[PDB]
């Protein structure tokens, strides 16, 4: 009967091993169309990366094994607003994706614990934006559109960055 509001421990740019996948070029356009009426500032498409692992271990390998390549798929479930440890707003697109969850699981199975207690598939669309009634109304209209017109996404091959 009550829903919890989300304070997210954003590991972006901190030391560790960051494994991610990008929406396919086709999916980048589909997402951009989705948010084409957004009244607040959004991250450029080039900045849309989907984390599949953020491992904070102090000793890390140079390379990692990845699952057999495939067209990874997700449904764009909804847009929502989280806050980070500093109180700043994050607008994220939540992803329903057994594929991304299984990738996360397979990567962790190599002795690379994920930096959050539970894996959450999402991509970040805005940060420190103008969060007013117009912003929240746009997000609600986007969420209705994601229900009335289901949006399915595909993602590229995995990439990894080590913040050393």
Number of individual domains: 1
Can you count the beta strands? 8
Provide the CATH superfamily: Cyclic phosphodiesterase
Q: Approximately what portion of the residues adopt beta-strand conformation?
A: 25-35%
Could you estimate the helical fraction of the residues in percent?
10-25%
H-E order = EEHEEEHEHEE
Rounded Rg: 16 Å
Number of helices: 3
CATH architecture title = Alpha-Beta Complex
Explain what you see.
- The chain has one domain: Alpha-Beta Complex (Cyclic Phosphodiesterase, Chain: A).
- The longest helix has 16 residues, at 133-148.
- Strands 1, 4, 5, 6 and 7 form a 5-stranded mixed beta sheet that branches. A 3-stranded antiparallel beta sheet has the order 3-2-8.
- Helices cover 23% and strands 30% of the residues.
- By secondary structure, the chain is an alpha+beta fold.
- A hairpin with a 4-residue loop joins strand 4 (72-84) and strand 5.
- The protein is globular.
- It has helices spanning 25-34, 98-108, 133-148; strands spanning 7-8, 16-21, 50-55, 72-84, 89-96, 122-127, 152-155, 159-163.
- The PDB classes it as viral protein.
- The entry lists the keywords Phosphodiesterase, viral protein.
- The assembly is monomeric.
- Phosphodiesterase from Burkholderia phage BCSR5 in the closed lid conformation.
- The protein is Anti-CBASS protein Acb1.
